């Protein structure tokens, strides 16, 4: 499913925000965040092992918007390559169009970044798409269209873009609403909350 529900309520028991309605707000601003989303359908305790072990598996899973199947499949291409299995996986996960656009400042929210690509206002190269996954690669060209240098939603997401460092492996152009995905990601510096060893144990039978 694409969700469509109460973003920030998740934050509470996520114990992290991970970009839920970022633009003016984050934790404990006009919202009740860092609680438990139950009265006593769920409330804080010591935590189980297996809790953690499931939660973190979903941590990595949710900040791309990938379904059940997909992320496993990426694992079946990684453990088919003779290179690093850990690296490869997070490499394939960032090939999704929706993730790339957010990191070119297009969308102030992860959900919003993916809700751009939906309405016809995106394109890649001279090709028009409306597909939230694509093959994104070195020296591609991320392109805004005509009647998307016209929408007042897009502009209103450049605000936050001035407030996020933006990656160094892509050119980013907001002045003509382009930017190229000129070279491969670095994850020498995004594995900072990601322990690959954990998840790949679990996936294994």
């Amino acid at each position: 499913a694409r969700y469509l529900g109460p973003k920030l309520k998740l934050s509470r028991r996520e114990g992290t925000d991970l970009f839920l309605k970022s633009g003016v707000r984050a934790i404990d601003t006009k919202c009740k965040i860092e609680q438990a989303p139950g009265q006593h359908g769920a409330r804080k305790p010591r935590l189980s092992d297996y809790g953690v072990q499931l939660r973190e598996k979903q941590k990595v899973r949710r900040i791309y918007g990938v379904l059940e199947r997909q992320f496993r499949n990426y694992y079946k291409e990684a453990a088919r390559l003779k290179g690093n299995t850990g690296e490869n996986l997070l490499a394939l996960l960032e090939g999704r169009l929706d993730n790339v656009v957010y990191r070119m400042g297009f969308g102030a929210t992860r959900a919003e970044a993916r809700q751009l690509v939906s309405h016809k206002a995106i394109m890649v190269n001279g090709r028009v798409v409306n597909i939230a996954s694509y093959q994104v690669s070195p020296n591609d060209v991320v392109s805004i269209r005509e009647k998307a240098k016209k929408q007042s939603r897009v502009k209103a997401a450049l605000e936050l873009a001035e407030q996020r460092e933006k990656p160094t492996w892509l050119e980013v152009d907001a002045g003509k609403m382009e930017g190229t995905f000129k070279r491969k990601p670095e994850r020498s510096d995004l594995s900072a909350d990601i322990n690959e060893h954990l998840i790949v144990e679990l996936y294994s039978k």
Binding site: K82, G83, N84, T85, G86, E196, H197, V200, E201, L202, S204
Partner: peptide, 21 residues
């Protein structure tokens, strides 16, 4: 090398702490 830490069971935890990964 190019793999993570292989094995579940009791031999998950002692197979880290023994310097091995």
């Amino acid at each position: 090398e190019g793999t993570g830490i292989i094995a579940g069971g009791a031999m998950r935890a002692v197979l880290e702490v023994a310097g091995v990964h």
